[model samples]
Target: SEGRRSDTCEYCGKVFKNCSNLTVHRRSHTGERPYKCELCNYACAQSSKLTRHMKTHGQVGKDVYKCEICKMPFSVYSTLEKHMKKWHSDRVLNNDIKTE
Candidate 1:
């Protein structure tokens, strides 16, 4: 396997035909969601997903969960739960499921 098609992700087992392809793929594994949506706190691995998400902005339940103590908002429940467990361990949560 020379330069013809030797490129493979050292982090992952998948094989790639080129170096840049693996680099782009690693962004997903590294939590590098650069593509962000202005309409909401949505993010993705590629710009095309955000472009697709923008189409939905033409129409909009805006599920927003706020921390009762700090007033910080979360887009998802797992985030809120983690915040509750990390910051408010002493206080019991009304909802179930402690950690992720």
Candidate 2:
């Protein structure tokens, strides 16, 4: 009885047994993102991944990345980092600074 079967991966030496298991894993090799975000141009292979990306739409560009230095806000961490380095480079950090 053929209770089990093997599926071969054409791109590599990988194999699968279950039906959709091959399709699911294939996405990673194929660079296929079936799920795309309506709020942004981002895409992922799984709906759950897309759901996680959607939350970023609410968190970003709305004061989430507020500067710890000037109270200025940013949508992305990189922007906040750049702002800090450019505006407050010479300042010493409290934890890194020495105390008497």
Model 1 steric clash pairs: none
Candidate 1's error at 51, in angstroms?
16
Q: How well is each residue in 1-100 modelled by candidate 2, as lDDT tens digits? A: 4443467554334556765877677766463244544455544344444443444445445433355457565443444455566456555343232223
Candidate 2 lDDT: 0.49
What TM-score fits each model?
0.29, 0.27
The whole-model lDDT of each prediction reads 0.55, 0.49
Ten-residue segment with the worst summed lDDT in candidate 1?
56-65
Name the best candidate (by TM-score): 1
Q: Which candidate is the best by lDDT?
A: 1
Candidate 2 residue pairs in clash (backbone atoms < 3 Å): 61-75
Hey, what RMSD does candidate 1 come out at? 10.2
Instruction: State the lDDT of candidate 1 residue by residue for 14-88, as single tens digits.
Output: 578779988987775553244444557665444444444454344334533355567676544445656677557
Q: Scored by Cα lDDT, where does model 1 land?
A: 0.55
Give the deviation of candidate 2 from the true structure as CA RMSD: 12.0
